[PDB]
Design a protein around this motif. Structure first.
Motif: not given
Ligand SMILES: [Mg+2]
Lengths: 66, 445, 608
Positions: C528-534
């Motif tokens: 989920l941290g992949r889309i946390l840095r959107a």
């Protein structure tokens, strides 16, 4: 020439397969099957398999939250 | 449907018993308060000119905007045997009940009231510290008894028989305990005067002579009474049910004088706020209400944590939700309690976003839930996962000749209210065992 | 109980819990604090005056259990008490402040808990005199208590330097904790690495507070900092190195990632790659400057069982050089068998462990008490979300109804092969087919995570779309990611347990998952941290989407809810998608044919 007494429950394919599991872990209780929404069960053991359905969804979820 | 239930019981009461009830000014005043504004207007219009009016004059007076409520008022007026509609000289001569009319006239003029306002002693005492506190004490004892926590001061034996015989707090003696029915969770959810009406409705339903008009009249002057005064101890049946409702905590009686508390006025009429509960996606409770009663009624379906002076806190668990569902409490009852305990901040934000989305579209591609569903629909999807099945046990047939015979027999069973299931595709249906003989007889004929 | 307190009739379920015996002060309105006498769980009101001022000390002395919208939940712990007294905040001032902000009289159980949380701070100090641990004390007074303990072996003595890790635990139970607060300016012997930054970089105030955490005294306090994904944690570490200014190395158990932090480092810092070096599976060439960097990987120390002599010479060289500071990136995997040996091997005068998530499968996260120290700073997910410092994400759960045939085969299946059997339901294929149609109609970049590399290839090949798993050639992998990022015409990717980490992709905005480990809360959160840095996170109308295709009527319900509860603890609830609009409106449904379902079941049977 067939009209016999039985307990007809409107059901689901999933809980139908659960009733067949009930037959598997203790056999010759449930009598016959019509379709996925109609099965015929022993009218003496309707409450036995009702409480077994209760422990079946207890095994399915068990929702501890402790 | 509370005034509707009272009117329904009055219409079940036969015509001459009703006319006996219409004899006295206090009963007629109470019934004058029950009737709608239109029927109230009709009887006050008629009470000072003794002229039987045709119905066509009333049709001329009535604007058709309120025609439906006019029909409701005159239908209740006729069915309560209070109107006399006869088509004398061809047109429907209308007449108010004359005993009701003269008793309302004497009440309005202050004429012959026969102390239907109350057989006064007028030896008044303080009501705030004696009457209200005794009423609060006894009503607190029966309220915690209806919660389920143990308490020393049990209710009386006749109201214990009320709870036993009635389906309201089924005293299951096989388990040895009073038990919360679904009807009794509805009783808990009821308003205070609604609860009083339910108690008297059950009590009158099972009490028999104990004269019926004595019960009626005595209750209507009990509602008509005021607070904090002494009164004369009336009929014998009215006196012993007066001592009965004294044991209910309703009157402070010094064994001929008696002092009716605030509950007589409560029976007569009602009366971030109190009870405004902050809902949470965290499922944590920040109530704006604290009482031992509040903790007592919230512990039935909530894991609670601690009490402060207005905020008693806790957590909704799915174990607590399933505990409520296994207590016979409806999910509709639980969510209905949640709208009775909604909170202003989430209500304001839901109203703003309601106007915002209704500016866009009514559909919104989502199911409808105006209150924030992250607290609600998580419970309500689990509440959708509460019952979610249906079981038929007993007699069942199959493989009919024609669909018309299938629909005829199934439709007949639905008309007499014995049909439990049907399926058009399989041409099969299930009926109750009580309805088996009637369906078989119809099938032969 | 300092009261009479006749109990409530329903206070029996308040099992030592009805805390209304202690009185309410009239200052209950302004003050926000309620105190649990037994548990120490601490209540904070968000809409109360001075709660914003008191919340800093609430983090300093207590741990935060939860911080929702209305009423925050905290808890006093000896860990945070140790952190507060290590910062320097004496007991009577702390007690006076909390009672001055406490609505109620304070429980003496919690008061004496604070009093018993008094340590010998500044009293035990290990100094590394050129790779030699000299365990000094500030006085000979400490030595008489210390000699009572006999596990070991002003005044220092011989200790096995590996046994320092265990005797730090041992002195935590005998309650004389050592401190690591580097006097780098007074350590003239280690060569300083005076490297600055550019003025164009902007330090956010939480990063400034984090820099103030280990610099309460200016001496380099060693500890733990965990921050959300995409918070510029690389830039915070670069700033910390640029203010430490000594010889320093960077560690992380990967390669692609380690070289991209090398790129990012030498990008924003003023240090030239002349001072930098890299040591991994591929290349083993070092810088020879007196001060500088070896950014590297755990791979080069975790395996010494079979290494080349080139490897052996480099590990000899870096062991011989004594460093000042170390950086431990993604520290949630270090306490295992060959992995925490890097702590034993490397001797630096200051430490810091860093990760995206401080959770794992067990309580080896408590080993950091005697591994890397206390926790210095943390940021708040809701705070950075509503401030636009991280994204505002809609989280959704998609329950796929389990079909009958895969259900009965699932019930007759053996337990650990049941996982694939529930995953192979065709209703999942139909639902994700309509969802990828709807979100490419929306024009969203869609990402699928599966634990089974074969099942991920099955879904990607059924969609006729590229595949990303653990053991593919790297040139094929860079071809696929080049097409996806640079080519606008390629937009949807299927990732796995090597694609959740080791790469930097802030471009991700719509995420789906179908499979993971049993209790992989940490690996789930790394996914989920992949889309946390959107980075599209400041404009209105933005709501990033997370989905999860879960097969109904399974214990995958229990597994998914147990894994996703960590994110709910972070403050991310998942909306309901059970019956959706447009399930039938898409004309094609993948294996909607019952015979096609039978043939797919036949294929998974043949493999099974
Ligand atoms: Mg991200």
């Amino acid at each position: 020439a067939r009209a016999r007494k039985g307990a007809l429950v409107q059901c689901d394919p999933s809980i139908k397969a659960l009733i067949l599991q009930i037959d598997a872990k203790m056999s010759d209780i449930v009598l016959e099957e019509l379709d996925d929404t109609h099965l015929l069960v022993n009218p003496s053991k309707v409450e036995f398999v009702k409480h077994e359905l209760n422990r079946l969804l207890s095994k399915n979820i068990y929702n501890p939250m402790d | 449907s509370l005034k509707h239930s009272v009117t329904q019981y009055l219409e079940e009461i036969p015509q001459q018993v009703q006319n006996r009830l219409y004899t006295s000014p206090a009963t007629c005043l109470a019934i004058y308060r029950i009737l709608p504004p239109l029927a109230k207007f009709f009887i006050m219009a008629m009470v000072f000119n003794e002229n039987e009016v045709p119905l066509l004059d009333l049709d001329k007076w009535v604007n058709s905007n309120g025609k439906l409520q006019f029909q409701n008022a005159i239908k209740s007026m006729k069915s309560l045997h209070l109107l006399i509609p006869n088509k004398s000289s061809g047109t429907l001569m209308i007449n108010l009940n004359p005993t009701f009319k003269i008793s309302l006239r004497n009440a309005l003029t202050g004429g012959e009231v026969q102390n239907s306002f109350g057989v006064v002693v007028e030896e008044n005492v303080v009501s705030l510290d004696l009457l209200d506190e005794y009423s609060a004490n006894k009503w607190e004892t029966i309220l915690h008894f209806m919660v389920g926590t143990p308490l020393a001061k049990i209710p009386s034996e006749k109201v214990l028989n009320l709870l036993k015989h009635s389906k309201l707090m089924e005293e299951v003696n096989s388990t040895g305990e009073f038990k919360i029915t679904n009807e009794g969770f509805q009783f808990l959810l009821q308003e205070i005067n609604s609860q009083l009406w339910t108690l008297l409705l059950q009590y009158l339903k099972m009490i028999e002579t104990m004269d019926l008009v004595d019960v009626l009249h005595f209750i209507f002057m009990l509602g008509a009474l005021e607070v904090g005064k002494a009164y004369k101890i009336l009929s014998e049946t009215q006196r012993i049910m007066l001592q009965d409702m004294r044991d209910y905590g309703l009157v402070f009686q010094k064994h001929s004088i008696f002092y009716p508390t605030k509950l007589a006025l409560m029976l007569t009429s009602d009366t971030i706020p109190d009870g405004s509960l902050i809902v949470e996606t965290n499922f944590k409770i920040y109530s704006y209400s604290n009482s031992p009663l509040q903790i007592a009624v919230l512990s039935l379906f909530v894991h609670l944590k601690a009490r402060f002076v207005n905020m008693v806190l806790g957590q909704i668990t799915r174990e607590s939700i399933r505990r409520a569902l296994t207590n016979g409490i409806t999910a509709d009852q639980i969510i209905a309690y949640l709208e009775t305990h909604a909170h202003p901040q989430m209500r304001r934000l839901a109203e703003e976003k309601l106007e915002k989305k209704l500016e866009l579209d009514p559909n919104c591609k989502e199911p409808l839930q105006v209150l924030p569903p992250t607290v609600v629909d998580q419970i309500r999807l689990w509440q959708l996962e509460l019952d979610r099945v249906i079981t038929y046990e007993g007699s069942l047939y199959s493989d009919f000749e024609t669909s018309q015979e299938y629909n005829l027999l199934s439709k007949y069973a639905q008309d007499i209210g014995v049909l439990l299931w049907k399926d058009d595709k399989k041409k099969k249906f299930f009926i109750s065992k009580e309805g088996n003989s009637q369906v078989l007889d119809f099938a032969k004929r | 109980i300092p009261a009479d307190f006749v109990p409530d009739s329903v206070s029996g379920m308040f099992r030592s819990h009805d805390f209304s015996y202690l009185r309410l002060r009239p200052d209950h309105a302004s003050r926000p604090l309620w105190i649990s006498p037994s548990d120490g769980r601490i209540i904070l009101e968000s809409f109360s005056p001075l709660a914003e001022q008191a919340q800093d000390f609430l983090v300093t002395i207590a741990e935060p259990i939860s911080r929702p919208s209305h009423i925050h939940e905290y808890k006093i712990t000896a860990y945070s008490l140790y952190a507060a007294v290590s910062v320097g905040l004496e007991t009577d001032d702390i007690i006076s402040v909390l009672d001055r902000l406490s609505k109620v009289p304070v429980a003496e159980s919690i008061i004496n808990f604070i009093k018993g949380a008094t340590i010998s701070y500044g009293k035990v100090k290990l100094v590394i005199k050129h790779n030699r641990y000299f365990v000094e004390t500030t006085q000979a007074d400490i030595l008489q208590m210390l000699l009572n303990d006999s596990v070991i072996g002003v005044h220092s003595f011989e200790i096995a330097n590996e046994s320092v890790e265990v005797v730090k635990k041992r002195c935590q139970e005998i309650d004389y904790p050592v401190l690591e607060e580097y006097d780098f300016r007074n350590d003239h012997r280690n060569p300083d690495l005076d490297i600055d930054l550019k003025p164009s970089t902007q330090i956010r105030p939480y990063q400034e507070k984090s820099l103030s955490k280990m610099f309460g005294n200016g001496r380099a306090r060693s500890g733990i900092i965990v921050l959300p994904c995409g918070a510029g944690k690389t830039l915070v570490g670069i700033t910390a190195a640029c203010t430490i200014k000594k010889s320093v190395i960077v560690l992380c158990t990967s390669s692609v990632s380690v070289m991209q932090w090398r790129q990012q480092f030498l990008q924003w810092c003023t240090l030239q790659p002349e001072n930098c070096a890299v040591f991994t599976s591929d290349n083993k060439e070092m810088f020879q400057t007196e001060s500088g960097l070896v950014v590297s990987t755990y791979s080069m120390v975790a395996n010494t069982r079979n290494r080349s002599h080139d490897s052996q010479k480099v590990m000899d060289f870096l062991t011989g050089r004594e460093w000042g500071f170390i950086i431990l990136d993604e520290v949630h995997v270090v306490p295992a068998a060959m992995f925490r040996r890097v702590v034993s091997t490397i001797a630096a005068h200051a430490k810091l462990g860093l990760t995206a998530t401080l959770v794992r499968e067990d309580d080896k996260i408590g080993d950091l008490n005697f591994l890397i120290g206390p926790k210095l700073y943390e940021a708040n997910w809701m705070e950075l979300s509503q401030k636009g410092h991280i994204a505002n994400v809609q989280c959704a759960e998609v329950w796929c109804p389990m079909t009958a045939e895969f259900y009965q085969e699932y019930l007759r299946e053996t337990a650990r092969k049941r996982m694939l059997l529930y995953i192979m339901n065709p209703t999942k294929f139909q639902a994700c087919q309509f969802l990828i149609q709807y979100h490419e109609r929306r024009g969203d970049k869609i990402i699928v995570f599966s634990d089974n590399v074969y099942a991920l290839q099955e879904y990607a090949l059924k969609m006729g779309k590229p595949f990303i798993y653990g053991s593919t050639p790297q040139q094929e992998r860079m071809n696929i990611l080049q097409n996806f990022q640079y080519n606008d015409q390629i937009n949807t990717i299927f990732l796995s347990k090597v694609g959740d980490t080791s790469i930097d992709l802030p471009e991700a905005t719509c995420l789906i998952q179908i499979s993971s480990h049993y209790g992989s809360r940490r690996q789930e959160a790394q996914r989920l941290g992949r889309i946390l840095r959107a980075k599209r996170r400041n404009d209105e109308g933005f709501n990033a989407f997370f989905y999860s295709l879960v097969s109904k009527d399974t214990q995958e319900m229990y597994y998914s809810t147990k894994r996703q509860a960590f994110l709910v603890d972070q403050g991310y609830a998942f909306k309901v998608i059970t019956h959706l609009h447009g399930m039938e409106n898409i004309p094609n449904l993948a294996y909607a044919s019952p015979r096609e379902r039978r043939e797919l079941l036949q294929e998974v049977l043949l493999k099974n």
